[PDB]
Amino acid sequence: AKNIKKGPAPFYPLEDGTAGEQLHKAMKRYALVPGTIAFTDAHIEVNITYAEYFEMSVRLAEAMKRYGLNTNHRIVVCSENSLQFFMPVLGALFIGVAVAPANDIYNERELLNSMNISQPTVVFVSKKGLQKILNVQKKLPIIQKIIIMDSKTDYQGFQSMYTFVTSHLPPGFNEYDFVPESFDRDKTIALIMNSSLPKGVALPHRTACVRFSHARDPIFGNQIIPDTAILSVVPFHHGFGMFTTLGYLICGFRVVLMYRFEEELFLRSLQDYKIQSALLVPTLFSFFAKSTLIDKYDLSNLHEIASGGAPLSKEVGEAVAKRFHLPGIRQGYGLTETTSAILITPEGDDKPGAVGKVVPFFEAKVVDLDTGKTLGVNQRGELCVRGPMIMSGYVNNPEATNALIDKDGWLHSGDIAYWDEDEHFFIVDRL
Numbered sequence: 001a002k003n004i005k006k007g008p009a010p011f012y013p014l015e016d017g018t019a020g021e022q023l024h025k026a027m028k029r030y031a032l033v034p035g036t037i038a039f040t041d042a043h044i045e046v047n048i049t050y051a052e053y054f055e056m057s058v059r060l061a062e063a064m065k066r067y068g069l070n071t072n073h074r075i076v077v078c079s080e081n082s083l084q085f086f087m088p089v090l091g092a093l094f095i096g097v098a099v100a101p102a103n104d105i106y107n108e109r110e111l112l113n114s115m116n117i118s119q120p121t122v123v124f125v126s127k128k129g130l131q132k133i134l135n136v137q138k139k140l141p142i143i144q145k146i147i148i149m150d151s152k153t154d155y156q157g158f159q160s161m162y163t164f165v166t167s168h169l170p171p172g173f174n175e176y177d178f179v180p181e182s183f184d185r186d187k188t189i190a191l192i193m194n195s196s197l198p199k200g201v202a203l204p205h206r207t208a209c210v211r212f213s214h215a216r217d218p219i220f221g222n223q224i225i226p227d228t229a230i231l232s233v234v235p236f237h238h239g240f241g242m243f244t245t246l247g248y249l250i251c252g253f254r255v256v257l258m259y260r261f262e263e264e265l266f267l268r269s270l271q272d273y274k275i276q277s278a279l280l281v282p283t284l285f286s287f288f289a290k291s292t293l294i295d296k297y298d299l300s301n302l303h304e305i306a307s308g309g310a311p312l313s314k315e316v317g318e319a320v321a322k323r324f325h326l327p328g329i330r331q332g333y334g335l336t337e338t339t340s341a342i343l344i345t346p347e348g349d350d351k352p353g354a355v356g357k358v359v360p361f362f363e364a365k366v367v368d369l370d371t372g373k374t375l376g377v378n379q380r381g382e383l384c385v386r387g388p389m390i391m392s393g394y395v396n397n398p399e400a401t402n403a404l405i406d407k408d409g410w411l412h413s414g415d416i417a418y419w420d421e422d423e424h425f426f427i428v429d430r431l
């Protein structure tokens with residue numbers, strides 16, 4: 001067991017209750033401080049506060065409950081990153097309805113394939129995705145109700161979130177008396193995510209509650225510090241964006257988003273919103289390695305730049321760190337089947353080329369590619385991980401599940417890795 005790498009102790013113990021209960025508890029607390037910003041849209045410059053966000057999510061929860069949705073139902077949220085995206089997401093977590101994020105700009109075909117797995121009864125969609133959802137509905141009439149996200153009034157005959165809510169709230173509904181549903185966090189699916197044809201990945205509420213431990217951890221996440229703002233350019237419909245944003249909400253952070261990358265807008269949003277931490281996909285890292293405009297901006301509040309979800313070379317990492325006058329790069333590794341990152345750069349413990357260390361509650365090992373036997377330091381082999389954020393299985397695909405997770409609960413990542421003397425993990429790119 002000398003060669004099984006173990007995750008440290010979480011700074012805070014893992015709270016009880018569902019992921020909806022934990023999100024509801026914390027967002028209510030932030031709702032009660034007027035003017036606490038939850039999301040800022042850098043394109044349209046509008047802020048929405050925790051009070052606005054909490055109340056509309058609670059209203060959506062109760063409206064979905066009075067409509068008839070329960071743990072036997074799934075919704076789809078199909079929308080690019082927006083101020084509205086997490087309203088139906090939170091509302092459905094509050095009542096144990098599973099949420100299937102759909103890749104907003106997917107062509108009709110991949111939308112159909114994602115949604116054929118997830119079998120949603122109600123679809124929330126932004127205006128520019130409506131016609132595709134309509135076409136998917138022709139082939140999957142289990143879709144019985146379509147709700148427009150970025151409207152206040154009805155749009156093209158369909159209810160908005162706001163008119164849908166007032167259609168089903170009881171008289172005298174009180175947003176601050178509402179109690180989120182209580183249920184078995186291990187068996188109630190919180191999210192159905194699309195795999196890297198893609199499979200549906202069922203994630204129980206428990207895996208998000210573990211993520212929330214990491215999110216608030218001073219070592220493996222962000223210190224809950226007032227007036228902390230994040231600038232994230234990560235799609236909400238994949239696991240990297242989904243569970244960093246849910247964690248930032250748990251921490252009461254200001255989540256500044258852009259859904260169309262622009263060099264000047266991004267750098268000016270870093271400066272004007274006094275971003276402390278910036279969240280990029282690795283191909284935008286490759287971009288800012290080439291940028292020669294960073295020195296024009298006041299990035300003194302910038303404490304970290306973070307990457308995940310795809311290979312990042314050590315050289316690109318160091319090049320970006322230099323461009324932004326930072327000691328290094330914060331990084332994380334995970335799979336959709338893993339909920340979120342299970343290898344994370346601890347704060348200030350950064351090492352170039354490394355993806356980080358095993359997170360609290362998890363264990364990781366490297367196994368020989370021919371045998372399966374546990375290798376020691378620096379030996380290269382397959383990365384295997386085990387912990388409470390592993391998915392419960394692929395949706396209606398038990399064989400693909402078992403190919404990936406053996407009877408003892410190790411997940412075979414299909415990646416080549418090694419850990420070093422200080423226990424940092426490196427992912428070896430096959431080519």
Ligand SMILES: Nc1ncnc2c1ncn2[C@@H]1O[C@H](COP(=O)(O)OC(=O)[C@H]2CSC(c3nc4ccc(N5CCCCCC5)cc4s3)=N2)[C@@H](O)[C@H]1O
Nearest residue numbers: 239240306308309310311330331332333334335336340341
């Ligand atoms: N870091 C890294 N290097 C190289 N290859 C990597 C990689 N991460 C993933 N991969 C490759 O991607 C596939 C799996 O693809 P996927 O689409 O199934 O999913 C993901 O990559 C996705 C699931 S969640 C996730 C990450 N989640 C988080 C969460 C938090 C963080 N941070 C930021 C870092 C610093 C603060 C701590 C929190 C990061 C990430 S990433 N990615 C896999 O096979 C591998 O090949």
